[PDB]
């Protein structure tokens, strides 16, 4: 509750007391020591899930995938004490992280054996069996989507930064469609405010009736942002949320822009994306009445390195919405190419 | 943006970037000082308003009144040096600060001459004249309410190199029933939130579902709390806001409680108030279906010093909702004495 700050526009500095919110995206976080319940209980859950037709998992957040990847080996070594022949196999992740109709259960009992799950001093190995328990990757054929799980972990405590940086988790006991609360924080000071979490950071400004300023996106979640953690909820309709409600956008008057509607066909397959309201390099976003209609977002960069400069639209208000990705510039649905074809270009695979 | 943030919860030192609340209420004058626009144009305004019969502005906030009883002297001097005949006066405010109908004008130009700010300006004294432009004061009989003023000032910037704030201000040209947005801040981080103003500090928490935790009130405004600085403004109706909407309460689920409704007849005249959900000393609030209905707020201390030790109600989530005042402890409307008549106890002033 106690601390300090230092302003930038004015140089006044002061310590005091209050409530403090921090940015935790640009550095991709540090490396931490995750403690998912007792990894033995997680292993028992992975068994009882296979027994009932669950054959894989699709991560809800990159933290979940990294926890899986970092506990893969001990997961395989923890079941071999008893009569279980499963073999987890963790691959890379893809964007966006489509949902899963199943849910990992909650075991009432646990595999009786040693407690050696945490921090085994090296020398951990196991023998590969016939049947896998895949996690992400290209294992679609081995385990069809309808048999995959999604969104079954709930944070509990993430302190211990001075000496252990330990983040604790658990398997959630109830069905739900909304993101994790404990890692969300939002604040407002006069003419500015922000919504954010571990992977989401959203900024709003008081220009006139408030609007959307900027946002940085390293993953593409697909949960729903809780309403208790958003500003000025009522009076808004879901047809005008710039970040679709399906991609965990918040319902707010700060989450919008005059002239633009929900962006459901955007480049949600890129690895990293920055939402910025400004014209991309070489671009001249005109305003025309003869221009076309909404359509899938078209990258400004061709697979051959070619780019298209002139785009038009009717309903837009400058500056224009654009996504910045390591691949290149991706524009919004409203702004279509002014004369160039909408198909002889690197079109976003339909993200509807 | 960078800050200490010594996280008292985990005893963890931190650093980074973000946004920070500050509890600038309790350390009221250790930080804040207020001065208006150039008192020459303010003098011109008060001159062009007296033509319409303005009695003189009653303050909405302690900042405005404490500016009133700071800039009087040079305002009087600037009035006199121009040949104008008027005497500005100031008294002691009384809670609550009622809603006056009129509004100050805005001069199109300044007086061509008058620079009495120079030299020993503040301390020039002159006799009292026939014309009184009374600010605040006990002149309620001398000037009826309808000719007063209310809410005629805006904040534009604050923070200066004098190691204390120098809040710039100026006269309003716009009609408005809304509280000031520049000096208000709120935020939520995990399981904690806070609604903060220069005289209001309101704390909310997530137990089961969001609710109200504590409030510290040094003044009792009567402007409307803006919505854009409010969390979860949806699906809530005015009948349950514990702090009445008319007395500058925020419309939120965080500003509610189970078993309580709007408190219109609370002790909104006291010098200093704090809302704490704990029983007043020497008392215990029961819940019974046989208790009486709503009524005026009743203090727990009799005029002779005696206190009552039995209270009841029907619909309250037990036990307390109490206001902490300089002269005693005030209970809520829904809680009323069990044996003593309401006639003997000190009763809240008429604030319906």
């Amino acid at each position: 509750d106690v601390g300090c700050s230092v302003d930038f526009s004015k140089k006044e500095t002061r310590c005091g007391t209050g409530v403090f919110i921090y940015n935790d995206v640009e550095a991709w976080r540090d490396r931490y020591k995750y403690h998912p319940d007792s990894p033995r209980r997680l292993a028992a859950a992975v068994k009882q899930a296979w027994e009932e037709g669950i054959c894989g998992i699709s991560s809800v957040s990159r933290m979940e995938n990294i926890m899986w990847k970092s506990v893969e080996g001990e997961l395989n070594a923890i079941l071999e004490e008893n009569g279980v022949q499963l073999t987890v196999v963790v691959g890379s992740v893809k964007n966006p992280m489509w949902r899963g109709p199943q849910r990992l259960p909650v075991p009432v009992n646990e595999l009786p054996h040693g407690w050696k799950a945490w921090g085994k001093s090296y020398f951990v190995r196991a023998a590969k069996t016939n049947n896998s328990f895949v996690v992400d990757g290209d294992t679609l054929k081995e385990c069809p989507l309808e048999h995959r799980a999604w969104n079954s972990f709930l944070v509990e405590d993430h302190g211990f930064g001075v000496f252990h940086t330990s983040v604790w988790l658990k398997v959630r006991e109830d069905y739900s469609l909304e993101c994790d609360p404990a890692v969300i924080g939002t604040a407002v000071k006069g003419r500015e405010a922000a919504h954010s979490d571990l992977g989401y950071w959203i900024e709003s400004e008081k220009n006139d009736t408030w609007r959307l300023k900027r946002a940085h996106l390293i993953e593409m979640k697909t949960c729903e942002w809780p309403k208790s953690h958003t500003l000025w909820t009522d009076g808004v309709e879901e047809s005008d949320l710039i970040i679709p409600k399906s991609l965990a956008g918040p319902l707010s008057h700060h989450n919008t822009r005059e002239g633009y509607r929900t962006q459901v066909k955007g480049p949600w397959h890129s690895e990293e994306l920055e939402i910025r309201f400004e014209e991309c390099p070489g671009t001249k976003v005109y305003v025309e009445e003869t221009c076309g209609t909404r359509g899938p977002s078209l990258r400004s960069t061709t697979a051959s390195g070619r780019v298209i400069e002139e785009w038009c639209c009717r309903e837009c208000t400058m500056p224009p919405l654009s996504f910045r990705a390591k691949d290149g510039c991706w524009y919004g649905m409203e702004i279509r190419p002014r004369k160039e074809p909408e198909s002889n270009l690197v079109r976003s695979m339909v993200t509807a | 943006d960078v800050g200490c943030s010594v996280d008292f919860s985990k005893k963890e030192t931190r650093c980074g970037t973000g946004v920070f609340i500050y509890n600038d209420v309790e350390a009221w004058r250790d930080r804040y000082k207020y001065h208006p626009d150039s008192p020459r144009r303010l003098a011109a305004a008060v001159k062009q308003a007296w033509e319409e019969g303005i009695c003189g502005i009653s303050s909405v906030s302690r900042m405005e009144n404490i500016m009133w009883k700071s800039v009087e002297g040079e305002l009087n001097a600037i009035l006199e040096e121009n040949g104008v005949q008027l005497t500005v006066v100031v008294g002691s405010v009384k809670n609550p600060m009622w809603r006056g109908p009129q509004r100050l004008p805005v001069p199109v130009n300044e007086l061509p001459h008058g620079w009495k700010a120079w030299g020993k300006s503040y301390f020039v004294r002159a006799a009292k004249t026939n014309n009184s432009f009374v600010v605040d004061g006990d002149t309620l009989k001398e000037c009826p309410l309808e000719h007063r003023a209310w809410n005629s000032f805006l904040v534009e910037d604050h923070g200066f190199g004098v190691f204390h704030t120098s809040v710039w201000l100026k006269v309003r040209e716009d009609y408005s029933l809304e509280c000031d947005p520049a000096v208000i801040g709120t935020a939520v981080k995990g399981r904690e939130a806070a609604h903060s103003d220069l005289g209001y500090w309101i704390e909310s928490e997530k137990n089961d579902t969001w609710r109200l935790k504590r409030a510290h009130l040094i003044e009792m405004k009567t402007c409307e709390w803006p919505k854009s600085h409010t969390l979860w403004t949806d699906g809530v109706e005015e009948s349950d806001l514990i702090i009445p909407k008319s007395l500058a309460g925020p419309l939120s689920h965080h500003n509610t409680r189970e078993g309580y409704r709007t408190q219109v007849k609370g002790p909104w005249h006291s010098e200093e108030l704090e809302i704490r959900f704990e029983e007043c000393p020497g008392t215990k609030v029961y819940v019974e279906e046989t208790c009486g209905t709503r009524g005026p707020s009743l203090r727990s201390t009799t005029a002779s010093g005696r206190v009552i030790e039995e209270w009841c109600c029907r619909e309250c989530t037990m036990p307390p909702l109490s206001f902490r005042a300089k002269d005693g402890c005030w209970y809520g409307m829904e809680i009323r004495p069990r044996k003593e008549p309401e006639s003997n106890l000190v009763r809240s002033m008429v604030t319906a």
Partner: antibody
Amino acid sequence: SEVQLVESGGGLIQPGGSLRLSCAASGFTVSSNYMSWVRQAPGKGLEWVSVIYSGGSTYYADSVKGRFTISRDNSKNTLYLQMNSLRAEDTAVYYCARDRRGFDYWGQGTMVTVSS
Amino acid sequence: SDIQMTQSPLSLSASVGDRVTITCRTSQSISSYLNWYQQKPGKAPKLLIYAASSLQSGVPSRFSGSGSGTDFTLTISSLQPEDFATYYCQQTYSTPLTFGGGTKVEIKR
């Protein structure tokens, strides 16, 4: 007890009147589940009215916006729907359903008639 | 915008021992959130098949479903006298939780 939903509070009301429906629940808490209201007209299909999440958020069907309001009493574990400005075309049988991985539990229903 | 849930056929005729096929269609990819309910005249619906491939506990093993994307299906291996009712499909993906247009199966003659 067994998991069930039991409505009550139907009858005959003149146009423009008002009424409030109650759907009790047992075997689980409304606060940690997703609950809905479903209605079917005589001789027609099913239709969904409203939902109240476990986090408190609520959504309503377009045709009943403003006029209706869904809430719950956490002490008695009850689910409420407020019916104001009843029309003639609001005649149907109303059910409450629980969502876990599909509306796997339903209530018998209650009949509401609006005739002058 | 909401999601439409057309059904077909409106009604079909088939005798005991036949194999019947019904189709429910949706206007955009709802992942695999599809439900099938069996309502008899004047009764509340009940759930047969969820997840588009899974089987609610207790349902007899003659029911099965399949499909992906915008096209799903349901089938009964050996229709029986007591299966004279209507079948509604539903999706619990995003609000509003729309229902289907209904189909009535003539078990006899």
